[PDB]
Amino acid sequence: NITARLDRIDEKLSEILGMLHTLVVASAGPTSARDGIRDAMIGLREEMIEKIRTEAL
Amino acid sequence: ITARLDRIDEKLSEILGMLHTLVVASAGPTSARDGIRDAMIGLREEMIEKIRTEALMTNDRLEAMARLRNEESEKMAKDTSDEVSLNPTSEKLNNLLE
Amino acid sequence: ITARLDRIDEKLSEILGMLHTLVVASAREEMIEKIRTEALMTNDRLEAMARLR
Amino acid sequence: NITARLDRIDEKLSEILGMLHTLVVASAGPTSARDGIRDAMIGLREEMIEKIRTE
Amino acid sequence: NVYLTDSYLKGVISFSECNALGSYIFNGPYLKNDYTNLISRQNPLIEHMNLKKLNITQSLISKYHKGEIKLEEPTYFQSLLMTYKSMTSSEQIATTNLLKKIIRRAIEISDVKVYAILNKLGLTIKTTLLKKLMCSMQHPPSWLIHWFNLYTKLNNILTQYRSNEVKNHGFTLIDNQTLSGFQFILNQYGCIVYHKELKRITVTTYNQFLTWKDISLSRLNVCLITWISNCLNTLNKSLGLRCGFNNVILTQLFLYGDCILKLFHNEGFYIIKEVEGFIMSLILNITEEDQFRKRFYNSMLNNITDAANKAQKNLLSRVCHTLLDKTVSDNIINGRWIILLSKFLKLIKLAGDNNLNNLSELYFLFRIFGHPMVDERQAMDAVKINCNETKFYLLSSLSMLRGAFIYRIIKGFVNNYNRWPTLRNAIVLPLRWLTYYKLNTYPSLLELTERDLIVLSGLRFYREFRLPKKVDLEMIINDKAISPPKNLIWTSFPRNYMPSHIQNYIEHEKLKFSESDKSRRVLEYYLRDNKFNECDLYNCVVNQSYLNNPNHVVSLTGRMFAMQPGMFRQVQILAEKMIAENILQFFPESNYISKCSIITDLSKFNQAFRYETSCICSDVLDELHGVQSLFSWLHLTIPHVTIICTYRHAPPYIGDHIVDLNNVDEQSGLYRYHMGGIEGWCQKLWTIEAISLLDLISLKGKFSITALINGDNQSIDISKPIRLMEGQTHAQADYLLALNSLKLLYKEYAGIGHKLKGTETYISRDMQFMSKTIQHNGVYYPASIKKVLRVGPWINTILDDFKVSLESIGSLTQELEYRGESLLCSLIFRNVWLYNQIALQLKNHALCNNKLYLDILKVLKHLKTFFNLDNIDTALTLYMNLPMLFGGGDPNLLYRSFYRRTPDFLTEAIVHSVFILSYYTNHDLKDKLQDLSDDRLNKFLTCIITFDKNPNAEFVTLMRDPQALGSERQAKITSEINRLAVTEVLSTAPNKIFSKSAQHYTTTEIDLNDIMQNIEPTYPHGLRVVYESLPFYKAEKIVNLISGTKSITNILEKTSAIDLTDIDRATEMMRKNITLLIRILPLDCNRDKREILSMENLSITELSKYVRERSWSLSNIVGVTSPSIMYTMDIKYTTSTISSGIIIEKYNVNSLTRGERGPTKPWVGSSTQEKKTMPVYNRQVLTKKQRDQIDLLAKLDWVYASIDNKDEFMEELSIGTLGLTYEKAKKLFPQYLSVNYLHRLTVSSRPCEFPASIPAYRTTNYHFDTSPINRILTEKYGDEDIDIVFQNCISFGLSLMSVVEQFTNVCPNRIILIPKLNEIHLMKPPIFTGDVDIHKLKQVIQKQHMFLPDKISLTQYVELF
């Protein structure tokens, strides 16, 4: 049985991921770019990580 | 199992029931217009009271309070109505078009 | 099983405290490790194509 | 079986705790708190570039 | 050096110019007490001193301070000009006799096209139809003569200005003789009007004089169209337009609408904007059920009176301490204006007649009252309140919006690419979503749950789309202005309006900015950039160099148009382009099923989006393109930025020793902290937010939804399955759905902070208002007249170009025929405005004086002797009818009255000339062509065949236009004359990427000829595929754009002036293009041919083939030579013993069929696709800019499969434009299954689809059947392809079914179309014997290098498979 009570945990535990992740994107606003923080909240992305590899060479 | 699981599904309800009752207020101009002000996350009753005491700068604030609550506001109930009422000058004008 | 669910309850007892702190704070090293893991889990996917090149 | 589920669940409870560790430091305002995050990304670029220089 | 001033309103009526000018002239605050009036009085502008110093206006100002004359605001004078009638007994005779002549010549010109058509359809004036019309239109009505008289006087005051201001600079026209009792002083920089009998004066901008001229034109055209229509509808009740206006009620409707603009001043336009509101309600009152019409009408009478209260409250606000203080009437303060407004709306109601045809065309009434002087500061003061405001969101309503966007993207990839977008965060999902991911499918919206649109919001992606690593110069360059950077922003204000510490600051800041940044137009920003390279957009985008940047302003200018410095304009245009290339494919909306429609308007819709409500979805796009902050640039950057009204006459007050405007104090027209939502920018992005959010509303309401969005409108149609309670009717259930769902749409838009007010949204059952046009029961109720209004002498030209004016009068006067469904009302209205533009307005051209008219006088004298005509006026009847391709006067060939596109223009230019010559030569167009006792048609064709062969550069000219003839046998387009003038300029531009190209361009134009010259059977559309593949095409688009500016020789010398060098070349072009008909039809025994063309057994498509070949001296030209459907089809009305042809039949029941709908699917006629297989590769890995280069290369692989050298030709192309070896690129090419690239190929030079000269809805009345033709076409041509398009054989049928009704007042039950088989030739694909010049191919690619689409790196090729 216990998987069935645990699926009822996971579909709530992942609903929390959506809410908190939307709060991270929404919190990464104009005044994060004023402070130059933004990329630390949302993480580095392919076209800039790729650029850092050209600087590595 | 259940006696341990009881502790967990309770705490997922005490997280998720807070997240469904969080209000996000946009970034905006600071008080007395010196720079931007940073985007603010609060419980529904705490952000309704910030609008309530005029601590955050906004317009139609009666509707902002009444719409952040699970309620229907008077200017929305006027507009979304089935039949829409003539204001006094349009209620004069109509008689000339008959 | 028991210790798994107590470990889950303990990690949840931080998450309630962090979330309550966030609401009060409206008025770090674990994050730098969030980004340091993701940016190199990303970087290996570029190196995988640069090995096929 | 729970032997798989309870390690999926543990990693969601890691990423939630990492997201909250982003938000609770982004919620801080002063010049010292806003500095220590920027110089950590400048350090992280310097560590990423010196990592990829090995390979 | 010369300035040429505007001939029509373009841009705006500048309020702060009228204020700045009038405030200085009178030395007191004129239109408003805001800062421009104070600075214009303190330090006047030299352009205005030169007005005030005139010995006339210095007298008027002395008379004003003596108090004998009274000061008024320009909408007062709009009413005085429009309700003016004056007659001298000779003056009213002359203005009548001129309009009687213009009408007589327009009917005597139109007669030859009607005699051509009525003789074809077998149905001084010849056709009795126009002879009846000429008896009818013989006396013009007094309400029309008054609008033509005022138009002629305002056009004369303007043409007497513009032609004198070309002849000498700084000239101010002073005129009290032309329009009676008025005195105008008129200048490029200002206007003054005085009325002596009424003792009143106005001061206004030049653009307002253009506006009174264009109002008098707009009303002249409405009275001409509706008088022509009312005379046509007196002869046959189906021959004129759809509507049925009574004109005295139109002329009162105009004079009442100017009289509300007299009362309410400039603010009266707030009320005129709600004419749309009232006309929508009269439409709804006819068509909708009671619950919808009663509700709309009540919500509309709220809008009209909120706008009149707002007009009064604003008017009495601004006027308070101005010189206008005593100029607002007692009818405003006592409120009697409601009576006037009731008379105005009671006139709209009476004009509309409760007839839905009037009420769709009566949208012209929106445009016919002039334009508001838009206060360039108040339009910001009323918007900062919406954009500084804090917004509150539920975290659930953010999350469900981000999740709805991600859901549309997962549904997007799974539809298009048979995959999910690759996830960095898949470990978020629950098992019943991991199952959808691993099976690569999705839940449909009925399977979807609002908890699902939470957990989907938590996903993050991996990079699937890619940014172009080079600037697309054609996306990024356009003619229009741009803002200086922040520290130079003060250069947008005229130097006298700036304090000393700005003047002597900016003259030391220009010394630390590059020549690009100073330039303030987009062209010059690029052309001056001597450190440009193609990567330097991408290399700022991934580097985030727009975040917190010290050069940033947003500059607002004349409805506000918003612009910013070039580095940010690049980021905006790229952020908008990548959404168009890659994301719009996911959002293509860009017991009883109770049914509803809701409509919403997106004027406010930008100002509502803060960061948190649009960056959430934009961060999904930042993930998928792999870039931080590209699509979220707008809200991340602009909050830090001061927003300035930078209109020239609208400066801020600047405190002493402030120079950096992030430190200038906020004020009317300058503010900070705009929380995103700039107008037009990110419009494609917010359309993705609207369509996303609507698929969350549809989930919460548990109803099916369909959405359509374009520009400023969204239209939504909703179905909910419901079970009916007793006594409830379908209309009552539809209205309850509309209210329950409107309540939900308001709730969820407020849930994303977008407050809504019922002015902008309304509910309907089945009435729709897409694309400004009205559909009821699926019948099109056109807005035809609203398009036509501004038709007149110099429209849409540069340098008043005679050829572009003629073509654009033609282009607009088609809307009476393609939408208005009346051919003869298009002809007569067009032949008024063409006869006026030729026989009247060429006597006083701005640049040329008599010289263009003296050159028509020799063309007419030449036509007279060539055709043995009896008078120079009937030589003009002929000039006005034969086609522009032969240097004639007629812009709309007789083919395009039946099918909107032809595969060949020349055969239609020849057939149009054949048909018209029947008028003079008394041929019959139904019969086979024959000998007759005059040669004149044969003699015309003899001069079309027989000419001296002077081909030059005969391949590159067929590359750049596959239809073209050359050998000086066609009129020369603006682009081909000016390409040398542009390249001689660009060869002096500091930007290397333009300079090296333009230095080599005139040698690349030789190599791009000599590449192909050897290949034997020339196929012009195949040449065009080679042309569009080669890098020279993107380099040619730039030259072709720049060749269409005014002032070409002066582009980068910073003047609005035009160099006399360009007046000389434009005069050379116009004077050759007019006289062309004396060179095409020489008198010289027609190149000594003492036998004139035998037209017994002649085929006009074979003559057209021989001429296009002779004109190049190419031995064979292939594939372009397709026949004229209109000449091959004989038309008959009963099936004889022939039992053959294409049969078109009426499936509608009744005898008339205009304005009624049939049982058949509608028709647009679509051309059998270039059948191909797409190979298995990761399609998204390749940018559109090279994914279309692969299809051009694939076209060359199957078109030129047969050449002597296919392998080297594809190799040096593929190593050039793709950067791959041929056998490795061949994997990516579509493989083409169709046999015959002559009959089925796609390129820009070949029509894609072939619509009929009928509105689409009406095609439903008819059914078409080609079975009887297919017998003779199969077994005269051996089941092989034939040189014809059946899509035009059908579209000619469906339009002939409409035009035959209009002329006879019955829609005929059946028509049969029988081919003249002489016009039909086998379309066999040839072996392209000959060798491509592979060195000349390399030289084109090398000299061009900078313009190449990006090369496929092996880094990109492995990922692509």
Swiss-Prot record, chain D:
Using the chain's own numbering, where are the disulfide bonds?
A: none
Outcome (variant: E47G):
Complete loss of interaction with the nucleoprotein
Q: Which compartments is it annotated to reside in?
A: Virion; Host cytoplasm
Q: Share the record's PTM remark.
A: Constitutively phosphorylated by host.
- What does the UniProt entry list as the effect of changing G43S? Almost complete loss of interaction with the nucleoprotein
> Coiled-coil regions in this chain?
none
Q: Where do the record's region annotations for Oligomerization and binding to RNA-directed RNA polymerase L lie?
A: 1-31
Under the subunit heading, UniProt states: Homotetramer. Interacts with protein M2-1; the interaction between the two tetramers is required for the anti-termination and elongation transcriptional activities of protein M2-1. Interacts with host phosphatase PP1; this interaction recruits PP1 to the inclusion bodies. Formation of a complex PP1/M2-1/P allows P to target host PP1 phosphatase to the M2-1 substrate. Interacts (via C-terminus) with the nucleoprotein N (via N-terminus); the phosphorylated phosphoprotein P binds to N-RNA complex. Interacts (via N-terminus) with the monomeric RNA-free nucleoprotein N.
The family annotation for this protein states: Belongs to the pneumoviridae phosphoprotein P family.
The free-text function statement in the UniProt record for this protein reads:
Plays critical roles in regulating RNA replication and transcription through its interactions with multiple proteins. Tethers the RNA-directed RNA polymerase L to the nucleoprotein-RNA complex. Recruits the M2-1 protein, a processivity factor that is required for efficient transcription of viral RNA. Acts as a chaperone for neo-synthesized nucleoprotein by forming an N-P complex that preserves N in a monomeric and RNA-free state and prevents the association of nascent N with host cell RNAs. Recruits the host phosphatase PP1 to inclusion bodies to regulate viral transcription.
Q: What is known of its domains?
A: The N-terminus is important for viral particle assembly. The oligomerization region is central. The C-terminus part contains binding regions for the RNA-directed RNA polymerase L and the nucleoprotein.
- In Swiss-Prot or TrEMBL terms, this protein is called Phosphoprotein
Gene designation: P
Q: Which residues of the full protein are shown?
A: 130 to 184 of 241
Curated annotation (Swiss-Prot), chain E:
Q: What is its EC number?
A: 2.7.7.48, 3.6.1.-, 2.7.7.88, 2.1.1.375
GO biological process terms on file: negative stranded viral RNA replication
Region annotated GDP polyribonucleotidyltransferase sits at: 869-1361
Which Gene Ontology terms of cellular component type are present?
host cell cytoplasm; virion component
Q: Which reaction does it catalyse?
A: RNA(n) + a ribonucleoside 5'-triphosphate = RNA(n+1) + diphosphate; GTP + H2O = GDP + phosphate + H(+); a 5'-end triphospho-adenylyl-adenylyl-cytidylyl-adenosine in mRNA + GDP + H(+) = a 5'-end (5'-triphosphoguanosine)-adenylyl-adenylyl-cytidylyl-adenosine in mRNA + diphosphate; a 5'-end (5'-triphosphoguanosine)-adenylyl-adenylyl-cytidylyl-adenosine in mRNA + 2 S-adenosyl-L-methionine = a 5'-end (N(7)-methyl 5'-triphosphoguanosine)-(2'-O-methyladenylyl)-adenylyl-cytidylyl-adenosine in mRNA + 2 S-adenosyl-L-homocysteine + H(+)
Kindly list the cofactors needed.
Mg(2+)
Q: Which effect does the record note for changing N713A?
A: Complete loss of RNA synthesis
* Cofactor mode of binding and number, as noted: For RNA-directed RNA polymerase activity. Mn(2+) can stimulate de novo initiation but it is inefficient at supporting elongation of de novo initiated RNA.
Instruction: Name the catalytic site residues.
Output: H1239
The chain positions of domain RdRp catalytic read 594-778
The organism's place on the tree of life at top rank: Viruses
Q: Does the keyword Magnesium apply?
A: yes
What residues bind Mg(2+), as annotated?
A: D601, D712
User: What outcome follows a substitution of D712A?
Assistant: Complete loss of RNA synthesis
Q: Which UniProt keywords apply?
A: ATP-binding, Host cytoplasm, Hydrolase, Magnesium, Metal-binding, Methyltransferase, mRNA capping, mRNA processing, Multifunctional enzyme, Nucleotide-binding, Nucleotidyltransferase, RNA-directed RNA polymerase, S-adenosyl-L-methionine, Transferase, Viral RNA replication, Virion
Subcellular location(s) per record: Virion; Host cytoplasm
List the GO molecular function terms.
ATP binding; GTPase activity; metal ion binding; mRNA 5'-cap (guanine-N7-)-methyltransferase activity; RNA-directed RNA polymerase activity
Quaternary structure (record):
Interacts with the phosphoprotein (via C-terminus); the association of P and L forms the polymerase complex.
Sum up the protein's function in the record's words: Responsible for RNA synthesis (replicase and transcriptase), cap addition, and cap methylation. Also performs the polyadenylation of subgenomic mRNAs by a stuttering mechanism at a slipery stop site present at the end of viral genes. The template is composed of the viral RNA tightly encapsidated by the nucleoprotein (N). The viral polymerase binds to the genomic RNA at two different sites in the 3' leader promoter thereby initiating either genome replication or mRNA transcription.
Entry domain remark: Contains an RNA-dependent RNA polymerase (RdRp) domain, a polyribonucleotidyl transferase (PRNTase or capping) domain and a methyltransferase (MTase) domain.
Q: Which family does it belong to?
A: Belongs to the paramyxovirus L protein family.
Protein name (Swiss-Prot/TrEMBL): RNA-directed RNA polymerase L
Source species? Human respiratory syncytial virus A (strain A2)
Ranked from the top, the taxonomy reads: Viruses, Riboviria, Orthornavirae, Negarnaviricota, Haploviricotina
Query: What fragment of the full-length protein is this?
Result: 11 to 1460 of 2165
